[PDB]
Every structure is written in C-alpha cells, then in structure tokens.
Amino acid sequence: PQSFTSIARIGDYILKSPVLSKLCVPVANQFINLAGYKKLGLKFDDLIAEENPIMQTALRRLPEDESYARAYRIIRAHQTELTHHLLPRNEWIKAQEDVPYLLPYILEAEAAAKEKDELDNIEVSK
Amino acid sequence: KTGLHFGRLSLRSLTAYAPNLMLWGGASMLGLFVFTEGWPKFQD
Amino acid sequence: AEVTQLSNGIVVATEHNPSAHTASVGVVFGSGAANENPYNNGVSNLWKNIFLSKENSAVAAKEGLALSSNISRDFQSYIVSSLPGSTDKSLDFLNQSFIQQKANLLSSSNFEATKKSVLKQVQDFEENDHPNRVLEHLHSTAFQNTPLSLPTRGTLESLENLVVADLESFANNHFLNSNAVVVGTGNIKHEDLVNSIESKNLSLQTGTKPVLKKKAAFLGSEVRLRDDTLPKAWISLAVEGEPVNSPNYFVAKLAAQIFGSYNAFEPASRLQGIKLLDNIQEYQLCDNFNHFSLSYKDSGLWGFSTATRNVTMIDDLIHFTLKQWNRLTISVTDTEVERAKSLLKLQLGQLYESGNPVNDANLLGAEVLIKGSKLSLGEAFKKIDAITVKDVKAWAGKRLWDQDIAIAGTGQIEGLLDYMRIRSDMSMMRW
Amino acid sequence: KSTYRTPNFDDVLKENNDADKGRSYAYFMVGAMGLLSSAGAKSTVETFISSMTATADVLAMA
Amino acid sequence: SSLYKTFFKRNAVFVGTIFAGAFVFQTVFDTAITSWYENHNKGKLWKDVKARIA
Amino acid sequence: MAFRKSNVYLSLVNSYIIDSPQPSSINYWWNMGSLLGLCLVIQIVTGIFMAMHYSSNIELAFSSVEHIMRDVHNGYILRYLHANGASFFFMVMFMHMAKGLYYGSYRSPRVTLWNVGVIIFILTIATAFLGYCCVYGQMSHWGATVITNLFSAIPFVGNDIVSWLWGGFSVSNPTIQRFFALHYLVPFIIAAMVIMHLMALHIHGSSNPLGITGNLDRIPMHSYFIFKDLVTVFLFMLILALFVFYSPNTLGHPDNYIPGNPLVTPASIVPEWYLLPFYAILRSIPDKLLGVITMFAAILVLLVLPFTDRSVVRGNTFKVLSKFFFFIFVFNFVLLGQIGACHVEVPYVLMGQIATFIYFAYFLIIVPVISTIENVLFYIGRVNK
Numbered sequence A: 001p002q003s004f005t006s007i008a009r010i011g012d013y014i015l016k017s018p019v020l021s022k023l024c025v026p027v028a029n030q031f032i033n034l035a036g037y038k039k040l041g042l043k044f045d046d047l048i049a050e051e052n053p054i055m056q057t058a059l060r061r062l063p064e065d066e067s068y069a070r071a072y073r074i075i076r077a078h079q080t081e082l083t084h085h086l087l088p089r090n091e092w093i094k095a096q097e098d099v100p101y102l103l104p105y106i107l108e109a110e111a112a113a114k115e116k117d118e119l120d121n122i123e124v125s126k
Numbered sequence B: 001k002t003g004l005h006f007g008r009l010s011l012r013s014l015t016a017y018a019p020n021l022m023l024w025g026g027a028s029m030l031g032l033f034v035f036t037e038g039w040p041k042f043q044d
Numbered sequence C: 001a002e003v004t005q006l007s008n009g010i011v012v013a014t015e016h017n018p019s020a021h022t023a024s025v026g027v028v029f030g031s032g033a034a035n036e037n038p039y040n041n042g043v044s045n046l047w048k049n050i051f052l053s054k055e056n057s058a059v060a061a062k063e064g065l066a067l068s069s070n071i072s073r074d075f076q077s078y079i080v081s082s083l084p085g086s087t088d089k090s091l092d093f094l095n096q097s098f099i100q101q102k103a104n105l106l107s108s109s110n111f112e113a114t115k116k117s118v119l120k121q122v123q124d125f126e127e128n129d130h131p132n133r134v135l136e137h138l139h140s141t142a143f144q145n146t147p148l149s150l151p152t153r154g155t156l157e158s159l160e161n162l163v164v165a166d167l168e169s170f171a172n173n174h175f176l177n178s179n180a181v182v183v184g185t186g187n188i189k190h191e192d193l194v195n196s197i198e199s200k201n202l203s204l205q206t207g208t209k210p211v212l213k214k215k216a217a218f219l220g221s222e223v224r225l226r227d228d229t230l231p232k233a234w235i236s237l238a239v240e241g242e243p244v245n246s247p248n249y250f251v252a253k254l255a256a257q258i259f260g261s262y263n264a265f266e267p268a269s270r271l272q273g274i275k276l277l278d279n280i281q282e283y284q285l286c287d288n289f290n291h292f293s294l295s296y297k298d299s300g301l302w303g304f305s306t307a308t309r310n311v312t313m314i315d316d317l318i319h320f321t322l323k324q325w326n327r328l329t330i331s332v333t334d335t336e337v338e339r340a341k342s343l344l345k346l347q348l349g350q351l352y353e354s355g356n357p358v359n360d361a362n363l364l365g366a367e368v369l370i371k372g373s374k375l376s377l378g379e380a381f382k383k384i385d386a387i388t389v390k391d392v393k394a395w396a397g398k399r400l401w402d403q404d405i406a407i408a409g410t411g412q413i414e415g416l417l418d419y420m421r422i423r424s425d426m427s428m429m430r431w
Numbered sequence D: 001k002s003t004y005r006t007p008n009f010d011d012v013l014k015e016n017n018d019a020d021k022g023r024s025y026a027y028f029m030v031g032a033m034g035l036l037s038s039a040g041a042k043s044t045v046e047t048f049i050s051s052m053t054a055t056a057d058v059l060a061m062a
Numbered sequence E: 001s002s003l004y005k006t007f008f009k010r011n012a013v014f015v016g017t018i019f020a021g022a023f024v025f026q027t028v029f030d031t032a033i034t035s036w037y038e039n040h041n042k043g044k045l046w047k048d049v050k051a052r053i054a
Numbered sequence F: 001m002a003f004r005k006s007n008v009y010l011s012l013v014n015s016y017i018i019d020s021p022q023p024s025s026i027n028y029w030w031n032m033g034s035l036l037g038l039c040l041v042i043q044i045v046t047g048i049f050m051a052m053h054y055s056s057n058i059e060l061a062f063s064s065v066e067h068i069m070r071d072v073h074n075g076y077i078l079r080y081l082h083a084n085g086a087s088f089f090f091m092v093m094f095m096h097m098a099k100g101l102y103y104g105s106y107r108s109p110r111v112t113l114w115n116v117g118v119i120i121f122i123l124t125i126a127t128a129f130l131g132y133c134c135v136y137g138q139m140s141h142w143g144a145t146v147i148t149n150l151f152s153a154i155p156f157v158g159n160d161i162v163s164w165l166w167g168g169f170s171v172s173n174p175t176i177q178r179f180f181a182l183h184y185l186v187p188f189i190i191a192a193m194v195i196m197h198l199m200a201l202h203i204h205g206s207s208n209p210l211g212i213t214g215n216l217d218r219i220p221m222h223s224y225f226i227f228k229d230l231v232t233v234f235l236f237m238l239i240l241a242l243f244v245f246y247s248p249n250t251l252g253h254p255d256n257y258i259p260g261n262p263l264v265t266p267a268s269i270v271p272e273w274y275l276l277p278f279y280a281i282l283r284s285i286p287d288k289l290l291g292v293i294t295m296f297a298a299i300l301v302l303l304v305l306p307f308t309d310r311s312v313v314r315g316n317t318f319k320v321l322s323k324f325f326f327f328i329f330v331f332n333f334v335l336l337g338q339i340g341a342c343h344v345e346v347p348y349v350l351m352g353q354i355a356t357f358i359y360f361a362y363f364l365i366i367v368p369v370i371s372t373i374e375n376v377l378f379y380i381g382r383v384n385k
C-alpha cells in the first residue's frame, strides 16, 4: 500500500541530489544487509507481496526465464528457513545480482491503473 | 480535468446522495422514537 | 440535404443528393406487420417476396433496375433502384407491378413457388437466427393480445393457410392512396419526380384504410424458450419505452446510448466509457450486449439484448446491468451524458446520412407517414445538444424506476432467475 | 399452435393496469405489514429488555 | 396517483413513513384498547371499588 | 473418491485438519492458534463440570466455590485448572495477536480474518470478566462496582443503563445471578465466532514468516502439523500443570478469598492481571467520559492497522527499524500492565500518561512513518542513479 510510483518519486529525488546521495545511500546499504534477505538467497523483488492485482499483473508480464528462477529462489527460502539455517556463503545473493528486475513491470502496471481512474472521473468542460 | 475521487466514492457520486442521505438520517431518527418511546428518554 | 414534400392525395417525398450515383424511387405504405390479425399474419412478408420473385425481378433487371423491399412493424416499403438518368423507367416499372396490375405476379405458378420459398425462410429463421427470434418473442410477450405483437416474418402455423384471396384482400385494404408516400432518394430532383407522376397517372386506390380498434399496451410478462442443446443463452429484457412523435424520443435513445453496446472479443470495445464493463469483465459474464430504444407508432420498447456462454452466472449478468439502469434515476453523472450525446450524434449521422439510397428511402418513408414531414439532422442535433442530466433523471423515474419489464430468453436459460427476482432489481431499496 | 400465440390469461388480468395504482395497492399492504411488525418488534424487544430491570421486590426496598 | 412519487418512490421516505406510522399506532392503539377493556369491565376495577368506599 | 472427501461431514474435517495445505516454512509461533482451540475446550469442559455445583445467589456464591474446593472429588483440580487456565488463555492469545502483528498477518487479503480477531478478543475480555464476578470475592464485588459504574458517564442515559445493568441499585443479588447466565453463554458465542474465524482463514490460507507467496511449497496438515502441534500441546499442558498443582494461587489476587462485603472497601482494587494494561489506559485520562472511550478505543485501534501499514513487504522479518519499534511496543504493553497494578501515585501518573501515548502512537504515528522510510531505503539501496 505504498504505490511504487510514489516510492520512486521520493527515491529518485534522493539519488538526484548530490547532498542526500552522499548521506543516506550509505545508510541504505547498511540497512539492506542488516535485513538479510540475501542470506536466505532472495533478491528484493521476491519479497514484495503479490496479492494486490497490480502486482498480480506484473507477475504475468514477466518473461519465462525470470519467472522460473524467481519461482526457485522462493522455494530455496522456504526450505532454508524450514531448517532454521542460512544459505552457505557462496549461495548468498551478491550486491550486483540484486537488481530491480520487477520494478519496470510494476511502474507500467501502476501507471496503467492510475490512468484508468484519472479517466473514469474526467469532467468535460463544455 | 479530473474531479476529486479517492478510490470509489467520487464527489459527483456524493453530491447526488446527500439529498437522500438527509432522509435516511430522518428515517433512522424516527426509527429510534419507535424503539425508545416506551421508556422515558426525551430528545429535543 | 433538405427534404421536400407535396401532396395531391399521393404524398411525394424527395431528398435530392447530387453527389450520389444512384436514384432510388419507391412507394412506402404505412401498414406493416402491425395491421394484421393472427390468421392472415405473414401476408405482408409474402407480398414482399412476390415483388422480389424471380419472374418479376428478371423483368426489372432487363432495364438495369434492382428491386428492394422492407417489411417492418408499422411501415412497408417497395423501392426500385436505378441509374440517375433512368428514373422515369423505374416509375414505369413500379406502375406495372402494383398500380396498373397485380394479376401477373399472382399467378398460380408464381404464388405457390413463392409461398414455398417464404415457408422455408421462416423455418430457417425459427431455428437458426437466435438473437433475433428472441427479439421477435420479446414483442410477442410484451404486447400480447394486441396488434404490435405479431412477428414481421409471419408465423409458420399461420402462413400455410394463405390463399391468393388473402393476398388481395390485404391489398384492397392497405395498399391505398391515403396510405402511401412515394419517396425518391439519391440523385433525383423533386421537380422531376413530381412532374413524372403528373405526366402519368399513378393512382393507387380510393382511401379509408381500416381502423384497428385495439390500441397497443405494454403488459409486463416473460417467456422462456428453454432448450438445453444450444451453446449459449440469448436474453432480451425490456421496459415500455417511448413511441415516435414524443418529447422523450431522443432522451430514450440517449439513455440507451449511455450503456451502449459491447463485444467481448474486440480489443477496442472493452475500453469503452461504460461503468458496466468494470463488473462484467471480471468473470466474463457476457459475450455481447446492445441497448436498444425501439419506437413504434403507438408504443415502444427500451432495454437490452444479450448473449452469453457463462450460463451459470446469468443472474449476475442481469443483476449487474439492472443496477446500472437504476443509476439513471439517481446518480447518472454529467460526463456519462456528455459522451452519450457525442455518440448519439454520430450513430444518427451514420444512419440518416450514410451512403445507401435504399436505406434513406425507408427512413424518409417511415418518417413522413407517421409525423407528416421529416425532421432534419441539423435540427435533430439541437435536440440532443440540450438534454440535461435533469431530463434523463426525470425520464428514468418515469419509465425505468420500479416498472414492469418484459423478458424473453432461449438456450440454456436455467440459470436465468425467476421473474420477481428480476422485477425487484428495478428499484434499488438503498435509495 | 405457435409459440407466438400466448394462451388465455384473461381470467386473471386486471381491467386497467395504471402502474401508479397497482404499485400503490401493493405497497400499502407491504407497508401495513411493515408497520405492525415495527410496532410488534418494539414490544418483543421491550419485553426482554425490561425484564432485566429492577424487579418488584428490589423496588420495595428502595 | 402522485401518491407514488412522494411516498413509495424513494425507499428512504417509504420506510420513514413506516416508522412515523408506527409511532402513532403505538400510542393510539394502546389507549384505544385500554379504554375499551376497562369500559367493558366497568364496576369491577379498583378505580370503581375505590368510589364505593365513600 | 476417498470417503474423507466424499462425505458431507468428513470433508469439513478433511479440508480443515487433514488435507489443508499449510506453507512448509511456518515456525512454532503458528501453533498458538491450535493452543487456543485446546485452551477453549479446557475452559468449557471445566466450566460445565464446575457449574453443576455452583449456586449463583449472592448468599451462596462464595460459599459454593469453597464447596467445590472442599467437598467435591477432585474439585480442587477443576477450580484451579479453570481459574489458571483462563489466565493461560490470555497469555497464549496475547502471543497470538502479536505473531499476527509482527508477521504482517493483518494485511490484505486477511483483513476479514483480523476483524474477527478483534471481535473474539472483545468477547473473551467480556467472558473472563463476567466469570471473575461470579466468585463474589472482595476484588470481584469491587471489580464489578468500578467497571459498571463507568457507564454512568454517558450523558443523560448514564444512570438508566447502569441501573439496568446492575438489575437494582448496586451490585446485589440480581447482578451476580445475571453475571453467571451471561458468562455461561458468551463462550458459546466465542465458539461460534471461532468457526467464523476459520472460514475467513481458509479462503486465503496461512501466511509464512518470510512474507512471500506460499503457494509454491505446500505440505498437508495431517502427520506434519498435527505432530508439530502435539509438541506444543504437551508443553502447554506441562506449564499449566505446574501452575495448577505446584503453585495454583500465584496469578490470582489474594483478596479474592475474602468474601465480598459492600461495606468495606479493599486497599487497592485491581482487576485480574490481563486486564491490567487496559485498566491503566482507563485510569490515565483525568476524566470519566473520555476514559470509557479510550479504554474501548484501545481495542478498536487494532482495526486501523491494515490501513496504516504502508509497507510493500508483508511483516517485520526483513526490516531493521520495524522490528526494533515492535519490541518497544511489546515492552510498553508490559509496562502498562505494571502501572495498572501500582497505586495512583507520583510518578505513576506521568508514566501511565506517557506509556499510553506510546500505545496509540504505535499504530497511528510510528507504523506509518517508519514503514515509509523502510520503503525508500529498500529502493535507493539497490537502484543506482
């Protein structure tokens, strides 16, 4: 319930500014590996809850080769967390492999449901 | 231009119900005077 | 385009259009399928087919004349098309098919070979044209025991009793001088059409068509032609709409343009501005619907026809479109009217001012019989550019809000719920 | 017999429909049943609710 | 008549007439059935026996 | 097909306890739902066998609890299994409302499941209170006097509601005798709202402690979570049996063994230990009308939790800030269960006013703020611009 267009509007304001990118991007990096989804072998875009119909849409527009790997790193996480262990340190998701692969499939489904409601309340000036 | 919506209940679908919802607030205020007048409760 | 009228007992209508390359000339009577009793029903469908018979059409095709006719509820029509330099040849043929003679068409060889041809057309219509045999069953149960109930095609049980003597008794009562308009559309001048009828005689009959003592009255009912061996379930549902020559004529069409028409397989009829599509596309409740506002002479109809393969969720197709009908009374927006103005101004301009001069002769013929002249398209745009959202709400509580409906269905309509759970959807109970 | 000839409903039909009247000789008798069921469900609630109030021998010791 | 438009059209004013028609039916029918029940039993009630104690 | 699927009754057993696909990664916090089902049968079965000996008059209330503990065979077992088991109901349930508050089980599509949680929680507070006033001890007479005199603050309808609620003019014989036939009943309303709580769960299934979709790896319930529940059943039976045989009156107040006397007030009236946080919220507002509202708002502020959580990730498992501030909320809730036991003294009024501001600023201020900051930090940590 935070609507990724609004995250990326805030988030791109931080990265664009030179002052705030020096300041709270190193806070953001230390926040990521303290969370430790990498240690379970997940990227971030496995963690997003898939029960709203916007995110339910963007998991159908995904290609087959990425929706097969994403459907494996989830099952490796349900198997690792079941044993109350972590993944071995070679199997951890590294920094470069943690890319927003599902972000552009959401921002084109969010803007396509924003336009559906901006156009369902249009008031035509006569 | 776009009217104020906030999800489902837009303003245009609320200005057309506020004449009738003023009658449901009268039809429920008389709904209390059936089920309470019978024990002393004076509303004014 | 400016229509023009003249009368000398036989009223002549013309709509000159020099940018066309044909010229329809025809006679349009004002006694269609709503002027027959149920024992001679189909005699106007059979008067169409002996005009279009093979013996008669071959005589017309020698001069380069194509024949066309139309049998509606209230008006008949008999149009002869030609090239624009050959309009007097079309009247000379039209004179010698109805007016000068009818005994050549009504020979015993040409009759029984044509009655056998119609009796196959109705038997093919009765079991193969499913979204239209419901709409002819909707009229047969809304206006029951009343002359607007009779099907235009003619029933098969009543058509095999017709002899030639019933073909002529209908001719001597309705094909009269005080009943017909001679229309000329396409590239034809009104002065050339009037002087050609004056140069000949072209006098049909005397006058005084019969009176039709019953008046059309809506009677809310239902009919269920249930038949499980069909792939879909066709359903029409209608309230009593407005007749022609009424102040609520264009509001009844604009209210049937708000909910429009839909086709589930087209990728551009799914993005329309209807609010009904947000409820109807989630589980694919229907394949197509269309909202009609039929307007006959005495009464009318207003409602929607549909067709669906989702035969277990019909009672959500009906309930979700009957809740949208309730919004016309209470909370129809201003935008939802302002698109239905601009769609009605288009699909009237695509009807009265399209290409085909045969179709323009039926519309000119149906208009000047009922209301004496033709209301032009430029002055029927001002009537649509003035319908406010108060006028739709005042009309909707008059005709839609808690009124009796007429239902007709066929196919797998077991999932269609009973009457009093469809009639009860017309009033919202939450308003 | 065809399916376009509806059978004889004439013994049960009204002699004059007039849908402003037929929906008023029928919303009277629904509204009258609603009126006695709102004066009859006040007394059913007020029987059980006033049963829990201060009884007779408690009121004597007031 | 036009009785349908004012009363039975909007359900918010239909059921507002049921409750305002039950508020009058409570007060009147109870008084009309009490004043009959004591008038049918005139001479047996305590309000009459208290009048014989003169 | 199999008879467990082909029968009309057994397919309700089959689709709920035998073949129900549970996610294969749920830890031991997912057993607290099965314990509350067992702990409800413990209260109900040790309520029927105890109410065969209980007379509910104000003269024979406290004298017939002691008749249970002295004269009935194994009567000390029933009264102690059920007075302590009711205090184990609220400890399992407080760990059941805090699993779901932690792992994001309140979020959509389980808002219907969460709202039947708050309805069961209100009836369970109202059940355990109405049976507390059935012992007619000294803390239970003056408990019912303090609680039902809060409804004398409603304007102009105050005294008529209270005098209807007491059934008299004070807490007397009709109040205790109606606080038993009500308290007999409301467990059967909880036992129906639980069936209306499994139906809201069965349509979308349980969550899992990662907060991701669990439709991929599912294992059945039979012989996997039946035998993972039998571990914590036999543990909950063990910690109950220490608190029943070896130390039975540890949780309850000692003043509840004085027979209830309306003429002598005790030293400090406190409720039983689980209503003690809400009693400290009620006591914090220096007004009587706002106190009844805020003590009732503190149960209803759980309903604004699905709409104030602004996170795209379900649950606090992979979050740094929203796991720290959750345990501040839990140890604030324990502190409110301590200021409820202290007297109205300096400085337990500045504490109980501050530590009730942190109860309400968690749902309304902390959770929307630190979960918006926990979504920009998940974003700008990965996106390079």
Ligand SMILES: CCCCCCCCCCCCCCCCCC(=O)OC[C@H](COP(=O)(O)OCCN)OC(=O)CCCCCCCCCCCCC
Residues within 6 Å of the ligand: A081, F029, F094, F095, F097, F098, F099, F102, F209, F298, F299, F316, F317, F318, F329, F330, F333, F334
């Ligand atoms: C009306 C409003 C109702 C609100 C209820 C208020 C709370 C009621 C009090 C009950 C306390 C229940 C605490 C349970 C906390 C939720 C369960 C939990 O969060 O445990 C998981 C947590 C970390 O585990 P993860 O699953 O996140 O990590 C996986 C990594 N692969 O594991 C941990 O971090 C350790 C868990 C330690 C629990 C400590 C409990 C302390 C109890 C208070 C005792 C007070 C004595 C001083």
Ligand code: HEM
Residues within 6 Å of the ligand: F040, F043, F044, F045, F046, F047, F048, F050, F051, F054, F065, F079, F082, F083, F086, F087, F089, F124, F127, F128, F129, F131, F132, F133, F134, F135, F183, F184, F187, F190, F252
């Ligand atoms: C959710 C279910 C229940 C809860 C939380 C609950 C809670 C309580 C509590 C807290 C007490 C006071 C114990 C004490 O202080 O000694 C109590 C007492 C009592 N309850 Fe329950 N109860 C429940 C169900 C039932 C049922 C179903 C019955 C009866 C059929 C029942 C009958 C009694 C009786 C008779 C007492 C007698 C007083 C006593 O000996 O403690 N309870 N209950």
Ligand code: HEM
Residues within 6 Å of the ligand: F029, F030, F031, F032, F033, F034, F036, F037, F040, F093, F096, F097, F100, F105, F106, F113, F114, F116, F117, F118, F120, F121, F190, F194, F197, F201, F205, F206, F207, F208
């Ligand atoms: C008598 C009391 C209760 C019973 C018998 C009960 C029963 C259950 C059971 C059996 C489950 C499935 C097991 C589990 O998921 O842990 C469950 C899940 C749940 N319960 Fe309850 N419950 C009770 C009270 C509550 C309360 C008071 C709340 C919250 C205010 C609540 C909220 C939930 C939630 C959110 C879940 C889903 C957790 C998840 O699976 O992600 N329940 N309940």
Ligand SMILES: COc1c(O)c(C)c(C/C=C(\C)CC/C=C(\C)CC/C=C(/C)CC/C=C(\C)CC/C=C(\C)CCC=C(C)C)c(O)c1OC
Residues within 6 Å of the ligand: F016, F017, F020, F033, F034, F035, F036, F037, F038, F040, F041, F044, F045, F048, F049, F191, F194, F195, F198, F201, F225
């Ligand atoms: C989602 O998957 C599930 C799941 O489906 C279920 C069902 C449960 C289990 C939860 C429950 C079973 C809770 C439901 C609880 C009830 C319905 C309470 C009903 C309890 C009762 C005890 C009913 C009352 C009946 C009696 C008291 C009859 C006993 C008779 C007595 C006392 C009289 C004795 C007299 C004589 C003369 C013998 C889970 O834990 C679970 O998660 C794994």
Ligand SMILES: CCCCCCCCCCCCCCC(=O)O[C@H](COC(=O)CCCCCCCCCCCC)COP(=O)(O)O
Residues within 6 Å of the ligand: F034, F035, F037, F038, F041, F223, F226, F227, F229, F230, F233
């Ligand atoms: C009703 C309120 C909720 C109560 C929560 C209890 C949840 C767990 C129920 C445990 C029942 C175990 C039966 C499993 C089974 O039969 O598997 C049977 C065999 O299992 C066993 O033999 C277990 C030995 C008997 C265990 C006795 C436990 C009784 C303790 C009762 C405590 C709870 C009331 C089939 O197992 P299989 O399919 O792997 O072959």
